Amino acid sequence: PVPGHPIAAIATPVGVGALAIVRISGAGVLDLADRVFRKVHGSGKLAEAAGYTAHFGRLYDGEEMVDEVIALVFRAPRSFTAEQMVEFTCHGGPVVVGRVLRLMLDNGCRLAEPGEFTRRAFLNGRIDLLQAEAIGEMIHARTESAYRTAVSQMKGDLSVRLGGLREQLIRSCALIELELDFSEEDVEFQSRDELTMQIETLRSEVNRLIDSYQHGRIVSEGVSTVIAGKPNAGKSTLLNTLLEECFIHDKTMFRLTDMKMAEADLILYLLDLGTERLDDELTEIRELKAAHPAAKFLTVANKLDRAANADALIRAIADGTGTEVIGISALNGDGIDTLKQHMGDLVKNLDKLHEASVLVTSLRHYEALRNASDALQNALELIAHESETELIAFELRAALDYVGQITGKVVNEEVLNTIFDKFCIGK
Amino acid sequence: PVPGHPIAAIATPVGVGALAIVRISGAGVLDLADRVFRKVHGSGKLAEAAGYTAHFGRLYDGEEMVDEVIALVFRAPRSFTAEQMVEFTCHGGPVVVGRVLRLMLDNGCRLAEPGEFTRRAFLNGRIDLLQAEAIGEMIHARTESAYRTAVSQMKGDLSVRLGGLREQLIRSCALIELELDFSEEDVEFQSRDELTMQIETLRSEVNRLIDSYQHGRIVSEGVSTVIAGKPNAGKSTLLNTLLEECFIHDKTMFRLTDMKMAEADLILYLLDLGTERLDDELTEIRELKAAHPAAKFLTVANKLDRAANADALIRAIADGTGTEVIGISALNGDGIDTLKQHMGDLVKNLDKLHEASVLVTSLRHYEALRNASDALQNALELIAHESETELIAFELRAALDYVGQITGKVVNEEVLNTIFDKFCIGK
Ligand SMILES: Nc1nc(=O)c2c([nH]1)NC[C@@H](CNc1ccc(C(=O)N[C@@H](CCC(=O)O)C(=O)O)cc1)N2C=O
Ligand SMILES: Nc1nc(=O)c2c([nH]1)NC[C@@H](CNc1ccc(C(=O)N[C@@H](CCC(=O)O)C(=O)O)cc1)N2C=O
Ligand SMILES: Nc1nc2c(ncn2[C@@H]2O[C@H](COP(=O)(O)OP(=O)(O)O)[C@@H](O)[C@H]2O)c(=O)[nH]1
Ligand SMILES: Nc1nc2c(ncn2[C@@H]2O[C@H](COP(=O)(O)OP(=O)(O)O)[C@@H](O)[C@H]2O)c(=O)[nH]1
């Protein structure tokens, strides 16, 4: 259970508050703490204290009282990082808290890399990659549904389901992984008949998951929306009135941005109604819609506040493009309520299984679940007819390898880096 | 030791972090905690737990897992508020932390008024008014010297010294407070000779303190500086290049502002060098200096970047006003280093006793120490010659009343309000 280098970090948000937490972790941490911590009543040393036990004392830079704090000892595996840690919670002043962090840093600790604490929690096996990512997802969450999704993932709901898939991928895999030497007349009395039934129910279980990512990505990172249109359309004017940037409506988040339009849930084409000289740029809107059939298209006719006649003009833009058109005054803010309601339509019209089925989020998992079900189909369709008995065991191990990668069974230490660099120093 | 209404509050700074602390306190708080907290391994209830003991469990809104937290039980008088409190430290996401606070609020707690926690700590007598104010002073501190000053006051250094004054004000006061009935031929063999010596050493001890406020106010709330001059002088241009607003230089803070000039440590008069048509507004600068003799005056000749000749002009502004003049280009930033150095001169030239003498800060204390030494002089000079023996006991009780007010011996519950309204919700 090797401990890491002692590391320290401010664990609470930057700013002014009643209290802050400096948290240190790693090899010999509470011996280090003892050099600077001094118990106020009696001298019960921290290194002598039980886990989950709090101590009121003072921090010192040699006769220089840094602050009055409360030290929380954690021991053994029974901590967040699953190593030795103490957590000073001090007065929540920026100058004070910074002094505390420095004191730790001067007396043995190094500054924590971003997400290193959770990284250690995963590496020590207290928590898995899903759960690790879930911690991050919760802290950054800005929607209720995003928050609730991370709670589920932290609780491990997905991990349970994925563990229930590793089940057959241990069962049916090791069943053929023992063809190594004992292959003379190996059977289980019509055994391959049940193996196909194991895979068919196994692959369909993976498919139920790969499906939820459509809803999941929306809940996690919101409905990605592009605002298109030629210069002077009103793009800027709409953007800041609706609030790279995002806003919330009907418990759903919308990521507004410009430029990769491949992968974009909703396209809003802005064109200045009755103002456009060259109005056959509705040919342009016809070929945006055509180039992104997966997206939801929505034609936003701007500058409705002038020319009070444009009902026929709206219908002409509609008919000429086959898209849906909405009249908008981005300056005044007219019909915006109607535009917003049309935007909230995207989530409403999708699918969504019985709420028991947990939503998979994050591209990484999706792609792996795909890679798994492809290897599963390779065993199902490509191999299961007349093909060999050694190449089939390759595909099954490939699937178990893929399902396991999402939970961290196979550590990539670059998959980890992209995950934890996303975290902030302190977690 | 009457407990207050259970109150809850986010105790950590607003924002995004690894961890946050919701802290609740008051009557029956850990019974309330128990309705929502659920220990993860075993069911050791919080209300059954020892003080200074931490518990890892989950918060719930009835089958709805709010978060995975760690509860810290505090009991009896042995807590910050000196009442029953638990402190949940949860994942530091704004959505999460807010959910936690709501859970507390829905299950018995009310939202804490600002500074109520420290208010309770003072009211329960765990801590005094000085120490109470010191907590605030530390959290808001933005200078090292401001930080170190609050630490001293939190440690109680001033309180010790002031307690050492309450000494004689109990000794010499009750010595004459027993003239109530036992006055027939009361003596202590030439007793009044030592009483004057008690007061003379007592009043001079108060005077040592009233003196430190000159340095103290600077350390606490910084050198208050007014930037004066007629429109188009360059006031705005200087202000934002030097950074209502304040900046730091030579470990000292400068409060820049416009208008009450009564009470202002440093006045900078800006006038556009070589640019001023009506240059006999140096009559105006002569009568600012004359109207505020206590302040430090400093004539700042702006717009030096044009007219490369103004050495003679500088000297003319100098000679015509008897002030010190500095050439400044507020736009380019020339001679600003020289202006800053002249500003740092104010703190350097003052007094400062041997560093053992603690700095009194805060107008409130100052005025009270004055009120005390005035009552002390009333006993010393007004009374001690031929005056009565009943009116002398009035002045001595007045001094003890004044010295005691600064430490909270006499609670004003409006003195308290102005102090704690200054605090933020959570402390
Ligand atoms: N003071 C504090 N420190 C933390 O590290 C922390 C909080 N609070 N609040 C939220 C909590 C959530 N995460 C956890 C998870 C597990 C453990 C832990 O000590 N693990 C033991 C539990 C066994 C037990 O005591 O019942 C384990 O062996 O799993 C600590 C924090 N968390 C971090 O965000
Ligand atoms: N978790 C936490 N809670 C707090 O309330 C708190 C921190 N940390 N860190 C800084 C500390 C400073 N203030 C104090 C002061 C006294 C006590 C206290 O429990 N008083 C007992 C001490 C006796 C003992 O255990 O030795 C007393 O009777 O005076 C708690 C916090 N503080 C708040 O800002
Ligand atoms: N009358 C009117 N003018 C608008 C409206 N929206 C934008 N404009 C004007 O059109 C100009 C360009 O708009 P802008 O949002 O910057 O479009 P963009 O440059 O393509 O992002 C601005 O100077 C606005 O004054 C609108 O709804 N009504
Ligand atoms: N060349 C030059 N122009 C300046 C300087 N300082 C200010 N100005 C100009 O003087 C004008 C008024 O300055 P301002 O700071 O607003 O003075 P205030 O209105 O009295 O606060 C501005 O428009 C500046 O362009 C300087 O140091 N050099």
Author numbering:
A (entry chain A), B (entry chain A): 9 to 251, 270 to 284, 305 to 473
Article, verbatim:
MnmE is an evolutionary conserved G protein found in bacteria, fungi, and humans, which together with the protein GidA catalyzes the formation of a carboxymethylaminomethyl-group (cmnm) at the 5 position of the wobble uridine (U34) of tRNAs reading 2-fold degenerated codons ending with A or G, i.e., tRNAArg(UCU), tRNAGln(UUG), tRNAGlu(UUC), tRNALeu(UAA), and tRNALys(UUU). The crystal structure of MnmE from Thermotoga maritima reveals a three-domain protein consisting of an N-terminal tetrahydrofolate-binding domain, a central helical domain, and a canonical Ras-like G domain inserted into the helical domain. On the basis of the common feature that the G domain cycle is regulated by homodimerization, MnmE has been categorized as G protein activated by nucleotide-dependent dimerization (GAD), together with the signal recognition particle (SRP) and its receptor (SR), the regulator of Ni insertion into hydrogenases HypB, the dynamins, the human guanylate binding protein hGBP1, the chloroplast import receptors Toc33/34, the septins, and the Roc-COR tandem found to be mutated in Parkinson disease. The X-ray structures show MnmE to be a constitutive homodimer where the highly mobile G domains face each other in various orientations but are not in close contact as suggested by the GDP-AlFx structure of the isolated domains.
In the case of CtMnmE, a polyethylene glycol (PEG) 6000/NaCl-condition produced diffraction quality crystals in the presence of GPD and GDP-AlFx. CtMnmE·GDP and NoMnmE·GDP (grown in presence of AlFx) crystallized in the space groups I4(1)22 and P4(3)2(1)2, respectively, each with one full length protomer in the asymmetric unit. In both cases homodimers are formed via crystallographic symmetry by means of the N-terminal domains. CtMnmE·GDP crystals were incubated with a 5-F-THF-containing cryoprotectant prior to data collection and in the crystal structure 5-F-THF is found in identical positions as in the NoMnmE·GDP-dimer and in the TmMnmE-dimer. In CtMnmE·GDP however, no Mg2+ is coordinated to the phosphates, and switch I-contacts to GDP are absent. In NoMnmE·GDP a Zn2+-ion tightly links the G domain to symmetry mates, while in CtMnmE·GDP the G domains fix each other by a toothing upside-down arrangement. The corresponding Cβ-Cβ distance in CtMnmE·GDP dimer is somewhat shorter (57 Å), which is due to the different orientation of G domains in this structure and to the different tilting of Gα6. Although both GDP-bound structures have been obtained using GDP and AlFx in the crystallization trials, no electron density for AlFx could be observed.
